[PDB]
């Protein structure tokens, strides 16, 4: 009839029972200051909440701080004092622990979708995933899982619904218990799967652009890729994008490609061009194609492992486009080492380096010409450099990706280490819902119930461990 | 994805106007963004272009004289104009397009109704 049932379990003698006693206070206290630690670090902190994804580091600390405190404020009233708590103090204490837990999973579940938008949506995660948006849905968990614990104090007791109710919990409804069990299984078995889809869906997408999946050598790939085309050997440029007259300058190539065709040097430039669009500019590149048999001109749907194929394979590849936002086009070449002759517009510029390609003006078929002569003469002595050079430029340019996916993997961690502290003791209400228990089911559940504040004590442990900002943060402080 | 325009009509010359384009799509709607113009009995032409932030492009005949702004809260484009010119008079489409991060060649692009603009002198 009373929160902290001690008196059961009569094997503690009074030479354990202080041992016991003060090892769950000094378990309590050590939660509680590693807790407050968490918090603190976090507030004295500008880079760590400026972040969203770190956000719900602190709401998970708070959570745990909720099933510490009340604990040890659970411990003081029946060992220390002897007040037998009514009914209303026994609904606020199981309040309290349940909101700690729902707001746990929640946390999980909205830290789960912030990792899908970084992850599988990185272009849309930083207009998306704002700070604003962020701590107003955390509060609106925090609000309803708040509300979903305090329903009993609003007159959901099994008194007064004259009802059959719980045994190992007195004055606790069964209906309430099987719903709110229901529904944070639910919600947990529902992140055990988005998790998994995504540290799932990033392994097989984060690693593609990479020589490591390439069989073969440089030369002998570029010799059976341009037999396969019907052409010799020779210095090979690319050209992949969309045939149109704005965004991409197609033109300004098939221009450059008539200037150069005039020339002496002719014989050693091969061009593919991949592409498609407006019929005038695909008529265009026919032509070329027709007239010239070094040019060679795609316009089907290809796969992109034949694009890898294809990067890896020539030796240069142009990109005068006029708007650039991205130059995801230039981060697939150079991963798989081949130098860009690129336009400098967009977010082409502070990708290429003066070492890592060549830059052209844009819309100047003269200056693409220069270029490319430029590079024709640069090919006749070793490139390995550049390739190198090129690799470790795009290399850099993935290392967010891996830190998001180095997080994802703490919270999959967290979250496991929740699954195994929370498992059995939710198993009990589980075989309370379906079936009586004799008492020996509730020594277990008062012997397992400690899983809780030992899932409290063991998050800033993995808090610490895993984040190289927060640990630099706490050796900031000292 | 649906897209909704509006600031068509007739505008005095040296003057300036504002056209607003909102996409309604489920995760962040479009990715890039754009302002096309087709003059009677022409092609289409790229007028404007923008992603987020400094990301903007504009031709070189509008270069100086055409802005473009981007609403992320409403997720809607707006295009300023300034001393329109009597070339200008076009029907004007909002082009919306989404790109996929793994293949840099995938896209997937998105129309509006387009609405005439005529500059008189």
């Known amino acids: 009839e009373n929160f902290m049932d001690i008196e059961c379990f009569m094997v503690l003698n009074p030479s354990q029972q202080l041992a016991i006693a003060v090892l769950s206070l000094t378990l309590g206290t050590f939660t509680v200051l590693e807790n407050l630690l968490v918090l603190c670090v976090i507030l004295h902190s500008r880079s760590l909440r400026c972040r969203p994804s770190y956000h719900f580091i602190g709401s998970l600390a708070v959570a745990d701080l909720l099933g510490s405190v009340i604990f040890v404020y659970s411990f003081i009233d029946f060992h220390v004092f002897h007040r037998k708590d009514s009914r209303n103090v026994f609904l606020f204490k199981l309040g309290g622990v349940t909101a700690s837990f729902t707001a746990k999973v929640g946390s999980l579940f909205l830290a789960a979708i912030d990792r899908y938008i970084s992850i599988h949506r990185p272009l849309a995660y930083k207009r998306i995933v704002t700070r604003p948006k962020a701590v107003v849905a955390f509060c609106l968990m925090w609000t309803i899982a708040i509300v979903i614990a305090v329903l009993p104090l609003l007159g959901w007791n099994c008194e007064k619904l004259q009802s059959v109710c719980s045994d190992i919990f007195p004055h606790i409804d069964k209906t309430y218990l099987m719903f709110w069990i229901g529904v944070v299984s639910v919600l947990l078995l529902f992140i055990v799967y988005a998790y998994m889809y995504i540290l799932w869906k990033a392994g097989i997408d984060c690693s593609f652009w990479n020589e490591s999946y390439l069989t073969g050598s440089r030369d002998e790939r570029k010799k059976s890729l341009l037999s396969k085309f019907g052409m010799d050997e020779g210095v090979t440029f690319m050209f992949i994008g969309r045939f149109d007259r704005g965004q991409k300058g197609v033109d300004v190539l098939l221009k450059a490609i008539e200037i150069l065709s005039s020339k002496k040097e002719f014989q050693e430039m091969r061009f593919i061009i991949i592409g498609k669009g407006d019929p005038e500019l695909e008529g265009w590149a026919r032509s070329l194609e027709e007239k010239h048999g070094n040019v060679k001109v795609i316009t089907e749907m290809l796969s992109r492992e034949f694009v890898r194929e294809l990067y890896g394979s020539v030796d240069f590849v142009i990109i005068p486009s006029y708007f650039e936002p991205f130059g995801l086009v230039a981060l697939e070449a150079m991963c798989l080492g081949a130098i860009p002759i690129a336009s400098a517009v967009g977010g082409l510029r502070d990708i290429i380096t003066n070492e890592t390609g060549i830059l052209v003006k844009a819309g100047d078929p003269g200056e693409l010409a220069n270029a490319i002569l430029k590079a024709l003469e640069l090919s006749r002595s070793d490139l390995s450099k550049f390739r190198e050079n090129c690799k470790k430029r795009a290399m850099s340019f993935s290392d967010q990706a891996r830190m998001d996916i180095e997080l994802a993997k703490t919270l999959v961690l967290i979250l496991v280490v929740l699954i195994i502290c929370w498992g059995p003791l939710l198993a009990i209400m589980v075989y309370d819902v379906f079936g009586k228990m004799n008492k020996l089911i509730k020594t277990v559940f008062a012997f397992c119930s400690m899983l809780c504040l030992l899932n409290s004590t063991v998050n800033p442990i993995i808090y610490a461990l895993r984040s190289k900002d927060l640990r630099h943060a706490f050796r900031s402080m000292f | 994805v649906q897209l909704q325009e509006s600031g068509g009509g007739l505008v005095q010359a040296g003057g300036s106007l504002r056209l607003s384009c909102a996409a309604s799509?489920?995760?962040?709607?479009?990715?890039?963004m754009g302002w096309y113009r087709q003059a009677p009995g022409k092609e289409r032409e790229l007028v404007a272009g923008?992603?987020?932030?400094?990301?903007?492009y504009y031709a070189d005949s509008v270069k100086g004289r055409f802005t473009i702004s981007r609403d992320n809260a409403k997720n809607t484009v707006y295009l300023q104009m300034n001393s329109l010119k009597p070339e200008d008079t076009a029907v004007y489409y909002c082009?919306?397009?989404?790109?996929?991060?793994?293949?840099?060649?995938?896209?997937?692009?998105?129309w509006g109704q387009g609405t005439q603009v005529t500059v008189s002198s």
């Open positions: 082009a919306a397009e989404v790109l996929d991060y793994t293949f840099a060649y995938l896209y997937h692009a998105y």
């Open positions: 799509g489920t995760i962040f709607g479009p990715d890039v």
């Open positions: 923008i992603s987020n932030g400094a990301n903007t």
